[PDB]
Symmetry: none
Subunit: 315 residues, 2 copies
């Protein structure tokens, strides 16, 4: 378990900066050298390489990578070079700036990050952009979906693990009676239970719900709700039960079928490589009976593929 | 299931003719009597009432209804009095005579009627007007849309149900590769598959298409085509999968939002009352979470409303 990318042995930031300068200097690029260094260092080490590049090369590593590289390869490398919290912050801003909101990106990040990470994200977003994340969410999404995202962003959830069996039963009972008639869905109920109860409590509510309804909570969420609100509730449930399997499903859906959602593919591979990619891989193979490696290999190409395959770790 | 309007018990054509004559004779009209008779008889019985009116009243029932009644109420009653095939024939001619072609009416009828009905329509159109339906379609529509309508009109479709799994896969595969690039849509492909394959084959192609592309065929039709050609392909797909839901959507779109398309409202309610109105109602409520009855009641008024509500059957 854990991630694929780890801190390098023999790490020499100045030498790595020299390798990267040699790779980019003059016409042409040695992409293999860029990959061979950066995909073999963790995020913290990459920042030390940025620092060493500035002082020993007298140039800006991020500017140089941006100018040298293009398209999806450039996106993966620049994402790799970005500090963890700022990467999340940048991806949320990109999902909202304008436009036709990337609601799936909002859900993926806000449902899956831990409370201290969400706090850091809120803080950094405001510092960087001079606007609150919550305010931007309110302008760019609406209705029940909007209420879910605001709750995740504010941290409207109990962070302890107190278990009252009687309260677990009433929550499950509440969700059951709500499933009784087609007009009877109480989305406010769903929102409140799924966004406010602590993780232990919720894992127990899911077990009790199955017991009294004979249905998994996910089944009823799908039958009873729709749209981005449904997707948001499903992501909270999945991230509570098995976060690596949540990400394995995001990866699958970004590649399977007609077209490729490279922006999601890239973001998940970059953001999870150091955390739980080994787990994501195992869950992917359990769920889909194919390796994640093989999906990446069959759905991408070029240097873009080469670097994704290292973030994947292999097989 | 089936329709709302059925053959009346105790049917006495002469008495009905007397009731209708009394209702119209002299200044003023008893619209409730006209509705109470005609909306409670089926189309075949209405023709027997026309016959009885001629011989026992010595007048022409259709002329008298036309002179007495006006606007949308008159349109529903005269449509009700018209033999099934001639009603279709009249509606197609009305959609084309002149002008700025009612392309939606052409699609609705030609995509939804069964082959023997299309044959009867072609025959009756030529007899009545001295022009072929296909020729009028060619003069009044163009391009790919025109090719679709001509195919539906000629009956260019296999009417058997032979299923070759290998041919189902290649059709789906063909539609997939076509969805790969923005310039890669092969509308000829779409036309040929959707207009020529038999219904069993096609229902299997839709399932396989979803499997290999992860998209419903309707989604790709919308992203890949536009205009009346898109609408025509969507109507063929919907009529293959769930014809009552096709009509429930026509009704919805004729009433929802700004304005009312009474000509479509009337034509669908008249033409489907004896066939599948109970199914249309159920699909309407499933799709829109409101009864069809309530839409009619909230969007029409007067005697026009009264008769539509009986064609709807109620709630
Ligand atoms: Na260069
Ligand atoms: Na009169």
């Amino acid at each position: 378990k854990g991630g694929t990318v780890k801190a390098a042995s023999g790490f020499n930031a100045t030498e790595d900066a020299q390798v990267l300068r040699k790779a980019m200097k003059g016409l042409g690029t040695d992409e293999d050298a860029i990959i061979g260094v950066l995909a073999c260092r963790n995020t913290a080490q990459r920042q030390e390489i940025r620092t060493a590049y500035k002082s020993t090369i007298g140039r800006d590593l991020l500017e140089d990578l941006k100018s040298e590289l293009s398209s999806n390869f450039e996106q993966v490398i620049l994402g790799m070079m970005t500090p963890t919290v700022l990467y999340d912050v940048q991806e949320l801003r990109r999902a909202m700036k304008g436009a036709g909101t990337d609601e799936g990106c909002l859900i993926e990040i806000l449902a899956s990050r831990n409370p201290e990470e969400i706090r850091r994200i809120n803080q950094t977003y405001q510092q960087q952009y001079g606007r609150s994340l919550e305010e931007d969410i309110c302008s760019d999404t609406s209705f029940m979906f909007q209420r879910v995202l605001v709750s995740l962003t504010a941290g409207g959830r109990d962070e302890g693990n107190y278990l009252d069996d009687a309260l677990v039963k009433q929550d499950a009972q509440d969700l059951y009676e709500a499933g009784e008639k087609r007009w009877g869905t109480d989305e406010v109920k769903f929102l409140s239970i799924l966004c406010s109860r602590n993780r232990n409590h919720l894992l127990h509510v899911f077990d009790e719900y199955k017991r009294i309804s004979q249905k998994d909570i996910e089944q009823s969420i799908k039958s009873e709700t729709s749209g981005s609100f449904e997707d948001a509730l499903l992501a909270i449930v999945k991230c509570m039960r098995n976060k690596p399997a949540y990400f394995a499903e995001r990866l699958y859906k970004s590649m399977k079928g007609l077209g490729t959602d490279d922006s999601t593919l890239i973001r998940v591979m970059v953001s999870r490589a150091e955390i739980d990619m080994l787990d994501i891989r195992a869950n992917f193979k359990r769920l889909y009976g194919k390796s994640l490696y093989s999906f990446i290999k069959g759905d991408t190409s070029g240097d873009y593929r080469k670097v994704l395959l290292i973030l994947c770790g292999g097989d």
